[PDB]
């Protein structure tokens, strides 16, 4: 008999090792892009590829959401290109394996909310975390400002 899908069942198409290596690859690519973009004093910055901006660029590249900035040097562009190829392959693999899962049942109807409830929980948790960080920043600036005056 078919069991009720888990809350975080949207991560099923890829193995947990793949997700772990995806996180490490993302971190490594962000660090390498930051290093090749800003280490050289002879490039000073002309680009906006700090560590925070490099992490944002890598995250946007993986999620296929474009980028507000683009690498301009040869090394930064090599990093961006290999990351783009990796992202394309991984996203295609995820979509293909999810389709295979939904087509063949092992021991079709519309996807129910229970199949994607975990992504909704993660979304709301991220919204709450961002709200908390913003409130913390505002409170810290409010106390620090009165210290100056």
């Amino acid at each position: 008999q078919k069991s009720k899908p888990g809350v975080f069942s949207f991560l099923d198409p890829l193995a947990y090792e793949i997700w772990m290596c995806i996180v490490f690859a993302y971190i490594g690519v962000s660090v390498v892009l930051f290093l090749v973009s800003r280490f050289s004093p002879y490039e000073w910055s002309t680009n906006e590829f700090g560590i925070f901006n490099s992490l944002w660029f890598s995250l946007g590249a993986f999620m296929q959401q474009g980028c507000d900035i683009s690498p301009r040097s040869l090394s930064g562009r090599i990093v961006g290109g290999v990351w783009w190829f990796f992202t394309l392959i991984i996203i295609s693999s995820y979509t293909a394996n999810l389709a295979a899962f939904l087509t063949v049942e092992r021991m079709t109807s519309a996807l129910s909310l229970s199949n994607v409830a975990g992504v909704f929980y993660i979304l709301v948790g991220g919204l709450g975390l961002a709200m908390l960080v913003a409130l913390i920043e505002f409170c810290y600036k409010s106390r620090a400002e009165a210290k100056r005056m």
Binding site: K4, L113, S114, A117, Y121, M131
Partner: protein, 189 residues
Amino acid sequence: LFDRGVQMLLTTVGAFAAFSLMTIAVGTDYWLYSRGVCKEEVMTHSGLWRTCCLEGNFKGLCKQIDHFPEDADYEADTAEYFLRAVRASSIFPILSVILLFMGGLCIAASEFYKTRHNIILSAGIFFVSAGLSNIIGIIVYISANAGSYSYGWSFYFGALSFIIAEMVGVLAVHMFIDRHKQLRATARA
């Protein structure tokens, strides 16, 4: 969107309407229209705490919802038990009601000691958090139910309450932005 007096009245009426709608949604047993045993199988209308008969032999017989049924419940993992516990308590709808009330009280108290601008901001975060709590409650309710049916007006009463709460949350921060704009504008002079 314009002026301040009309903005205050609009925000207040929106917050009050959202609070009333969410209170009705929490306290009314019209959330799901599904056939079930409300004592054989019959058409029933359900809510958050009790499922009650409809067009049956004994119409209007209202019975408590079995959230943790006996007779070989078959158990589950920790996640399913946790979800059932949240659904039984309906904390997230209750948390949404509480946050809506706190935001409304902050809005009401904002008129007193108007030099305190952070009260309107506090109401803004309260209303935004109430909307997020409404989202969590709706998702948890639907996931618990799914584990022919139609949703009642109170479920769509609660859906409107979340939607209203976000514009009321939107309006409050606009007021907070304008109040700090006024402080900067007079500071230049």
